[PDB]
Amino acid sequence: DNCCVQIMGGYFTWTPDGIPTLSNITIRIPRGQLTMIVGQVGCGKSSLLLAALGEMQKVSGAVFWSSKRGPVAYASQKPWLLNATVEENIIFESPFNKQRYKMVIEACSLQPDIDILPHGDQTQIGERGINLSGGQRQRISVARALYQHANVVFLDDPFSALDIHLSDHLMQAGILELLRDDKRTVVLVTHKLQYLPHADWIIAMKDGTIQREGTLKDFQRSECQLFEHWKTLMNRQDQELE
Amino acid sequence: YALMVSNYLNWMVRNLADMELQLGAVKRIHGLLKTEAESYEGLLAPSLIPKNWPDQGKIQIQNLSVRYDSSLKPVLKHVNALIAPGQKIGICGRTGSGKSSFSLAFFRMVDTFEGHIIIDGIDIAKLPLHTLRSRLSIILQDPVLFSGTIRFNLDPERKCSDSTLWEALEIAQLKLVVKALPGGLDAIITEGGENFSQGQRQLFCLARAFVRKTSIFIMDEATASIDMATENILQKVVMTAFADRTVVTIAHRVHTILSADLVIVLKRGAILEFDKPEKLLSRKDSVFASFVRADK
Numbered sequence: 180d181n182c183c184v185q186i187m188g189g190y191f192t193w194t195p196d197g198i199p200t201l202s203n204i205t206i207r208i209p210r211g212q213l214t215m216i217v218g219q220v221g222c223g224k225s226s227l228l229l230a231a232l233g234e235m236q237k238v239s240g241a242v243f244w245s246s247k248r249g250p251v252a253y254a255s256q257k258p259w260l261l262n263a264t265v266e267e268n269i270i271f272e273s274p275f276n277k278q279r280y281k282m283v284i285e286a287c288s289l290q291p292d293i294d295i296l297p298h299g300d301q302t303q304i305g306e307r308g309i310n311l312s313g314g315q316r317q318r319i320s321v322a323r324a325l326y327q328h329a330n331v332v333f334l335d336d337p338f339s340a341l342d343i344h345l346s347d348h349l350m351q352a353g354i355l356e357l358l359r360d361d362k363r364t365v366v367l368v369t370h371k372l373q374y375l376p377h378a379d380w381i382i383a384m385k386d387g388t389i390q391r392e393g394t395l396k397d398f399q400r401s402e403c404q405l406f407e408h409w410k411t412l413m414n415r416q417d418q419e420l421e
Numbered sequence: 422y423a424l425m426v427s428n429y430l431n432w433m434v435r436n437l438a439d440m441e442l443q444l445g446a447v448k449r450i451h452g453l454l455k456t457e458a459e460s461y462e463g464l465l466a467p468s469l470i471p472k473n474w475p476d477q478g479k480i481q482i483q484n485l486s487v488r489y490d491s492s493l494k495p496v497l498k499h500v501n502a503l504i505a506p507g508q509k510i511g512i513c514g515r516t517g518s519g520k521s522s523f524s525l526a527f528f529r530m531v532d533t534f535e536g537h538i539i540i541d542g543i544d545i546a547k548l549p550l551h552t553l554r555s556r557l558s559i560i561l562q563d564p565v566l567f568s569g570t571i572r573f574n575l576d577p578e579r580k581c582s583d584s585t586l587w588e589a590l591e592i593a594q595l596k597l598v599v600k601a602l603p604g605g606l607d608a609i610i611t612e613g614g615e616n617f618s619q620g621q622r623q624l625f626c627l628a629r630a631f632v633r634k635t636s637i638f639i640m641d642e643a644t645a646s647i648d649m650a651t652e653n654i655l656q657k658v659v660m661t662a663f664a665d666r667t668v669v670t671i672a673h674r675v676h677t678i679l680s681a682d683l684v685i686v687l688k689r690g691a692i693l694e695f696d697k698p699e700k701l702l703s704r705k706d707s708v709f710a711s712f713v714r715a716d717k
């Protein structure tokens with residue numbers, strides 16, 4: 180079926196008491212294949228990825244991981260950073276390939292920000308060290324992803340603290356450039372809805388549960404109201420979303 | 422007393438050794454005691470300031486080049502604006518251009534090493550600093566929330582009724598999920614805001630900016646995190662409600678700031694363009710028009 184993440188009917192929660200956070204999540208994520216999660220604010224977008232890691236508590240439901248669980252790459256909504264060098268951040272206990280490291284820092288376009296740093300590559304950034312921008316920290320924390328040969332990338336939102344130029348450099352190069360080279364399963368949360376043409380599967384979720392999952396033609400045909408809300412919301416209302 | 426010598430010589434030298442080790446903490450706290458002040462008392466006397474100091478925000482920028490530190494370059498170049506009291510200003514630009522440097526120039530944290538800049542006629546740099554940062558309002562890209570409770574995190578100065586707080590939850594579109602919290606008000610926001618979402622943390626910070634009733638709210642990229650539907654809905658809500666207020670907006674997305682009055686474009690620390698968004702979109706060679714075109 181070529182499907183690595185097969186969470187069926189999960190009534191997941193954060194707190195062990197109270198109401199559950201998630202309810203009846205019947206999702207599928209295809210292998211080698213980019214998908215996108217779009218929901219509203221506070222509505223389960225990080226919670227699906229942390230339930231898929233099993234960090235959130237399973238009251239009911241069942242998770243059907245396939246190649247226990249392998250090592251996944253992950254970059255959170257808040258960028259966690261070490262007190263190491265920038266190269267030791269981006270490698271993160273891997274073997275250092277110079278050309279794979281070179282195409283990651285060319286793919287992220289962190290090269291002028293590593294050019295303006297006073298030791299360049301080996302500056303000890305972090306808490307003990309130089310404070311950063313936050314956007315540069317976001318690019319460093321996603322630059323530690325897509326390197327590990329880990330084949331599942333849990334890429335929570337990179338496109339908060341970046342502009343349109345660096346997000347098109349992150350969305351044409353990098354995402355769908357080197358992640359179409361090997362068959363790495365990339366999942367994204369993104370409210371910049373211009374990249375909704377650059378998605379094969381699409382998860383749309385609403386208030387704990389999902390609304391539907393499937394492709395853009397399936398949301399065009401079957402859903403066709405949140406599709407119209409995305410058509411008004413992206414403001415290319417003349418064209419047809421494909 | 423020879424037996425007193427052989428029982429107390431060790432406590433003499435061991436108490437000398439950890440006396441040196443504990444007095445290193447006095448040396449460290451006296452080295453950190455001698456830090457630099459910010460000089461919170463200003464040049465101008467606190468009697469020319471009225472009750473409504475920023476009643477009509479005439480932000481006249483003249484030749485304002487700023488600097489973060491003494492060793493660094495001038496980040497912003499020689500810029501000029503004439504900002505009306507009913508105006509709404511959208512500032513767009515690249516990362517690394519200086520647009521969130523320019524929002525800190527109103528609050529005197531980034532050092533204005535040359536420049537005239539005023540609001541309502543009278544100089545920003547010749548002001549008391551606490552009366553400057555008390556009667557003005559910012560909102561940042563970072564959501565920083567403290568521990569304790571929600572009425573403290575929206576009102577730490579304790580002086581407000583619950584109706585203006587729930588009016589701020591009404592104009593954040595936050596009221597429905599704060600009513601879905603099981604206290605109504607007065608539940609627990611944890612250390613850094615880890616009880617909620619990142620967009621909900623930024624919505625709490627937005628509503629904490631909405632409690633204060635000053636006529637200047639300035640806005641950094643708050644809706645970088647919060648999604649496009651609530652960006653449209655919240656942009657419509659803050660454009661209808663705060664009609665008097667001179668709102669300066671570093672918008673993260675350009676398609677929420679097509680409804681602005683006039684637009685600053687900042688590229689490499691300088692104003693490239695300053696006109697109508699219809700004029701700068703219809704010029705077709707302009708970098709604001711390629712910011713609209715590169716988005717959609």
Ligand SMILES: Nc1ncnc2c1ncn2[C@@H]1O[C@H](COP(=O)(O)OP(=O)(O)OP(=O)(O)O)[C@@H](O)[C@H]1O
Nearest residue numbers: 193219220221222223224225226616617618619620
């Ligand atoms: N760490 C947590 N502990 C307890 N409750 C949480 C936690 N994180 C989220 N919640 C609750 O679960 C719900 C889901 O929030 P979540 O963090 O999934 O938002 P999100 O939709 O991922 O945010 P964004 O819109 O930024 O993507 C929220 O209503 C929040 O109150």
Ligand SMILES: Nc1ncnc2c1ncn2[C@@H]1O[C@H](COP(=O)(O)OP(=O)(O)O)[C@@H](O)[C@H]1O
Nearest residue numbers: 312489493496515516517518519520521522523
């Ligand atoms: N804390 C800081 N200390 C020194 N320089 C800074 C600091 N923050 C930003 N800068 C410099 O100022 C320039 C503009 O930064 P900033 O205005 O913060 O971001 P943006 O241009 O994305 O709004 C950047 O090129 C950066 O090098």
Ligand SMILES: [Mg+2]
Nearest residue numbers: 224225618619
């Ligand atoms: Mg989230």
Ligand SMILES: [Mg+2]
Nearest residue numbers: 517520521522
């Ligand atoms: Mg900035």
